[PDB]
Symmetry: D2
Subunit: 287 residues, 4 copies
C-alpha cells in the first residue's frame, strides 16, 4: 500500500543503485532518486533523451517507475553546512534543497512519509593510495562521505519515516579481510559503516521500531569501481573463478536482496551485514 | 512447474518447521513433512482429528497445502543402519522406509525431483548436562543427530534435486557465544553445523550449482526448547527486553526468511549464517 | 640487547599506558613517554615532585626506568599541519617537536632506531552523545585522533624502526558489539582501527618485516574512562560479575600481554585483535 | 615450586607438540609426554637410540628436561571403554593405563598436581574424503578423537590441577573458511573445538579459576599433515608467498605462544582463538 523508497547514490545504470531500483520497481515500490550534483544534469539530459529506456525494461510489458529525481549531496547535513565556494560552483549554483536535511523535507512536503531508504554511495579523494600513504584529510574525507553520511541520512530521514521502516546500505569485505588496492581509507570507512549499522540498529529499533542492515556486495563494474585505477577486472575475474557459485554477479542480484531486506519479510533482521557475493567470502584460498 | 520442499523436523505446529511450512505455502510451494517416528502416529492422529486446522489457515485466500507426510529418522542413513532395539520398537515396527536414503527414494518415486530442502531438527540425549559433564556417547549423539544429519541429508537429497536448488538449516548463537544452559554438546553441534554449511556451500555450489545457508533463530517456545534448562522462558523474556526490536519473535518471522533464502531471489547468497533474532546478537550487554 | 619502546598516550599512572610501561620495564626495555601538551607540564611537575614514586615500584629492589618524556600531539603529522592558533596556545607555545614526524626525528637523533611502538591514546569531542546525535565534525574528530593517528604513527615511525619491530594499539569490543554509552563515534573509530590493523599488517609485514596487532582491553577506571560521564563503574561491575574470570582487571594485566606482543616471542602473530578482558567477550547473556 | 605440563599428542619431533615442549623447557617447565600407543614403542626406541638428542638441544645452556613419557589414547575415557580389538592389539597388549582417566591418576600418583595442559592431537579416519563423502562413522570419529578429547581431558585433568592453571589446544582456520582438502569432518571437529573452548572457558573460569585458549596455527609439515590431500606442501608454499610475514613458520613459533598462554603472563586471556600463522588469516585473496 504505497511504498516509497529513496535511493541515495545514482549517477547511471551501471551501479548497484540502478539494480536496486529495478528490483524494487518490480515490487511496485515508488522510486525517488537522490543524485550527486556533479553528475545530476548529465543524468537528467541522458534520461530525457531516452538513453536509459532500454535499461528501464523489466521482463516484458513492465517498465521501471521513477517517482522523482532530486539533486543530493551527502557531504552536507543542512543548508548551513554548505561552504560559500560550493554554493556558487558552476554545477551547484542552479540547484537547491540538496543537503541531507533539505531533501528529507522536500520529500516529506511532496509525498509525506516514506518507508524504505537506501544508502548506495561512497567516496574517497585518495582511494588510489594505500592506507599507509593516505593523508589525514583523505582518510577523513572517506569516512565523512562513505561512513558518516549513513548516520546523517538516518538522523534526518527517521522523522519522515513510518514505524517498521527499513534502511539498507552497501559495504565491502575489505573491511574484514585485506584487499590490496582498496585504498584511501575506504576499508576503514566500510568497517566503521558495518559497526555503525549495529549501533544504529539499537537506537532505531528501540526508539522508532525501524530496521537497518548492510549488504556486503561482491565486485561489479560500476563507474566508481573503475576510479580505483585494473582492480575491478581482477576482482571480477577472481570472484567468477573461485566463488562457490561461478556465475556473473549482476546488480539485480543485489537488488533482489535489498528488496527483501526493505520489505516486511525481513522484519526480524536488523543490524546485520548480509553477504551477497556468490559465497566468495567463505573461501580461504584459491583451489 | 511448481516447487517442492521437503521439511525435515515437524512434530507439531509450535516449532520453526511449521512456521517455514506456512510461509512457503503463501508462495504456493508444495510441502512434504519429515516426521520423527516416535511422534509420527500422534501427529497423524492430531491432523486427522483437525487439531491443526486453525494453524493451517493462511488467510481469506487459501490454506496450507501439504503434499505428503512421511516418517523420517535422521539417526539412520540407510536401511542397514537401523539397530535391533529400534527395529523392535513399538513406534517403528508399524512404519517403514524412514531412513534418510529411503525417504529420498520414496519422495522421488512419488513426486519426482524437488528443489527446496529444509533441515529443521536437532537432538542431544544429554542436553540437560553442561559441556564438562557430557559423556562421549552423549556428545557424539548431539553431533550425530544435529550436525551430521545435515551432511547426510545433502548427500542423499542432491540426486533428487534440480540444479539451482536451495537448502537451509537452523542454528543458534550458542555456537559463537557462551549460553550457559545450552548443554549436551548442542553448542558444539551448532558450531559444526555452521562451519559444515560453508564447506557444503563450496561443494554443492561448484558441483551442482546448489546453494545452502543456515538461519540463526532467536528463542521460540517449541517442544524441544521446552526440554532445555525454564531456560526458554528466560531466553524469551531476555530477548523481548533487550533485543533492538522489542516484539514477539514468531515462527513465521523465520519462515519468511527461510522462504526468501529458498527462492531464486537469493541466488547470490550461499554458505551464510543469517541471523533472525530481532537483532539480539549485536548487543554486548543489557542496557 | 637495548630495547627501546615509545609509548604514545600517557597523562598519569591510572591508564593502560602506565601499566604497559611497568611490565615493559620489568623486561628491561627502555621507555620513552609521548605526552599530550594539555597535560605535559602537570605530568612533569608531578614527576619531579616524586608524586609517582610509589607507582614506579616493581616488586622490591626494582623500580621503573623512564629513558625520556617528550611532548606529543597525535593530531599533527608534521610541523606544517599545526594551525597558527594551536602554535601560540598557552600550553603549546613553550613546546616544540611535538608533531608525529618531529617526535620520530627527535627520537632517532637522540637514541637511534627503536624496536617497539605503543599506541595508547584516543579522543572524541562528542563521546557523550550517541552515534545518532554525533555531528560530522565530532565523528571526524574521533576518527582523526583515535584511528588515523595509528596510521600516521606507523608511516613516520617505520623509518626509525629496525626490521622485526612490533607495534601494538588498544581497542574496545564496542567496535564489534553494541555498547550504549560508548558514543561520539568512538565505536566507529575502534572498528576502523581494528580494520586498519589488518591492512597495516599486510604493508608493514611485506615491506619492512614489522608486526602490528591490537589489544581489545576490558574496562579500567582511567582518567579518560571517567570523561564518558557512571559508564565505567557499570562496565567494571558488570565485567567483574559476569566474566569467566571474576577478578579485578589491572592495567598490568594488559601490560604483560603488550609486552609479549612487542617481544620476539610473538614473531608469528600480526594483524590480530587480541582480547584481554577476563573472557567477557565470549559471553552472550548474563547468568 | 616448579611447573608441570602434560603434553598430549607427541609422536616424533616434527610436530607442534615437540615445538611447545621445547619452548616450555626454556622456561624450566617439567614436561610429561602423552604418546599414542600405536607409536609409543617406536618413539621410546628412537629416544633410547639418541635420535632426538639433537632436537632436544636448547642452546649452550641446558637441554630439554623430559619428566616422563606415557602411553595415552584420547579415544578412551576410562579403562571400561576400551574394546576387544584394541585390548587384543599388538601395540596395546604390552601397555596399560593409557586411557584419559588412567593417565590423570598415574601422573598425579607419581608427581602430584600439574598446572599446564596441552591438547596437541587430532584424528579423522576419513580425512582424505571431502565432507559430502564422509560417512557418519567417519565424521563422529573425527569429532570423537579431535573434539571431545578436549572436553574429556579437562573433565579428568582438572582434579589434578592447581587453581590458576592453564590449558591450550591447537586448531586450524578451516573451521572458519573453506579449505578444500581438509576433509573427513576435520573442519567440523575444529569448529566444535573452537566453540567448546569458549564454553569450557566459562565453566573452568567460574568454577576453578582455570583458563583455556586455543591456538590456530598455520601449516607445518608434520606426520599428520603429511597424511592429508601434497596438501601440506601447497599450504606451506601458499603461506610463505602470501602471508604478511614471509618467513618460515616453525613449530617453536607456536611453542613460544603456547608458553605465554600457559604462564601467569596471560592471566586476563581466556576462551580465545589466537592466530599464529604469520598473519595469513587476514588476507582476502592473493595479491
Ligand atoms: N561496485 C562494487 O563492486 C561494490 C562492491 C561492494 C560494495 N559496493 C558499494 O556499493 C555502493 C555503490 O557503489 P557502486 O559500485 O554502485 O558505484 P556507483 O558508480 O553506483 O557510485 C555510487 C554513487 O554514489 C554517488 N555519490 C558519490 N558521492 C556522493 C555524495 N557526497 N552524495 C551523494 N551521492 C554521492 C555517485 O554519484 C555514484 O553515482 C558503494 O557504497 C560501494 O561501496 C560496491
Ligand atoms: N526453538 C528455538 O528457540 C530455536 C532457536 C534457534 C534454533 N532453533 C533450531 O530450530 C530447529 C527446529 O527446532 P524447534 O525449535 O522448532 O523445536 P521442534 O521440537 O519443533 O523441532 C525439532 C524437531 O526435530 C525432530 N527430531 C528430533 N530428533 C530427530 C531425529 N533423530 N531424526 C529426525 N528428527 C528428529 C523432533 O521430532 C522435533 O519435531 C532446531 O534445529 C533448533 O536447533 C530453535
Ligand atoms: N580504560 C579502558 O577501560 C579501556 C578499555 C578498552 C580500550 N581502551 C583504550 O586504551 C587506550 C588508553 O586509554 P586509557 O583508558 O588508558 O585512558 P588514559 O587516561 O590513559 O588516556 C589515554 C592518553 O592518551 C592521551 N591523548 C589524548 N589525545 C591525544 C593526542 N591527540 N595525542 C597524543 N596523546 C593524546 C591522553 O593524554 C591520555 O593520557 C585508548 O586507546 C582506549 O581506547 C581503554
Ligand atoms: N601441522 C599443521 O599444519 C597444523 C596446522 C594447524 C593446526 N594443527 C594442529 O596441531 C595439532 C598437532 O598436530 P601436528 O600438526 O603436530 O601433527 P602430529 O602428527 O605431530 O601431531 C598429532 C599427534 O596426535 C596423535 N594422535 C592421533 N590420534 C590420537 C588418539 N586417538 N589419541 C591420542 N593421540 C592421538 C598422533 O600420535 C600424533 O602424534 C593437531 O591438533 C592439529 O590439528 C596442525
Ligand atoms: O566498495 C566498492 C568495492 C568494490 Cl570491489 C568496487 C567499488 C566499490 O565502491 C567504491 C569504492 C571506492 C570508492 Cl572511492 C567509491 C565507491 Cl562507490
Ligand atoms: O537450538 C535451540 C535453541 C533454543 Cl534457544 C531453543 C531450542 C533449540 O532447539 C533445540 C535445542 C536442544 C535440543 Cl536437544 C533440540 C533442539 Cl530442536
Ligand atoms: O576505549 C575505551 C573503553 C572504555 Cl570501556 C573506557 C575508556 C576507553 O577509552 C576512551 C574512550 C573514549 C574516549 Cl573519547 C577516549 C578514550 Cl582513551
Ligand atoms: O589441523 C591440521 C591442519 C593442517 Cl594445515 C595440517 C595438519 C593438521 O593436523 C591434522 C590434520 C588432519 C588430521 Cl586427520 C590430523 C591432524 Cl593432527
Amino acid at each position: 500500500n504505497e511504498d516509497i523508497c529513496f535511493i541515495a547514490g545514482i549517477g547511471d545504470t551501471n551501479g548497484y543503485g540502478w539494480g536496486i531500483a529495478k528490483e524494487l520497481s518490480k515490487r511496485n515500490v515508488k522510486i525517488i532518486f537522490g543524485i550527486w550534483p556533479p553528475v545530476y544534469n548529465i543524468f537528467m539530459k541522458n534520461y530525457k533523451n531516452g538513453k536509459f529506456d532500454n535499461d528501464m525494461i523489466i521482463d516484458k510489458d513492465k517498465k521501471m517507475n521513477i517517482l522523482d529525481m532530486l539533486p543530493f549531496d551527502a557531504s552536507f547535513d543542512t543548508a548551513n553546512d554548505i561552504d560559500e565556494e560550493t554554493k556558487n560552483n558552476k554545477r551547484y549554483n542552479m540547484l537547491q534543497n540538496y543537503t541531507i536535511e533539505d531533501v528529507a523535507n522536500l520529500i516529506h512536503q511532496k509525498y509525506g512519509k516514506i518507508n524504505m531508504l537506501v544508502h548506495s554511495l561512497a567516496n574517497a579523494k585518495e582511494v588510489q593510495k594505500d592506507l599507509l600513504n593516505t593523508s589525514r584529510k583523505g582518510y577523513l574525507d572517506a569516512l565523512s562521505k562513505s561512513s558518516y553520511s549513513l548516520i546523517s541520512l538516518c538522523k534526518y530521514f527517521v522523522n519522515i519515516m513510518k514505524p517498521q521502516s527499513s534502511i539498507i546500505s552497501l559495504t565491502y569485505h575489505a573491511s574484514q579481510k585485506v584487499v590490496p588496492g582498496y585504498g584511501g581509507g575506504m576499508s576503514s570507512a566500510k568497517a566503521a559503516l558495518e559497526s555503525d549499522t549495529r549501533v544504529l540498529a539499537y537506537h532505531l529499533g528501540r526508539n522508532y521500531n525501524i530496521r537497518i542492515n548492510t549488504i556486503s556486495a561482491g565486485p561489479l563494474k560500476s563507474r566508481a569501481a573503475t576510479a580505483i585505477n585494473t582492480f575491478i577486472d581482477y576482482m571480477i575475474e577472481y570472484s567468477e573463478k573461485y566463488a562457490p557459485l561461478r556465475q556473473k554477479l549482476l546488480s539485480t542480484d543485489i537488488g533482489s536482496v535489498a528488496s527483501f531486506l526493505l520489505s516486511r519479510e525481513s522484519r526480524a533482521i536488523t543490524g546485520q551485514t548480509i553477504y551477497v557475493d556468490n559465497g566468495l567470502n567463505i573461501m580461504f584460498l584459491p583451489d
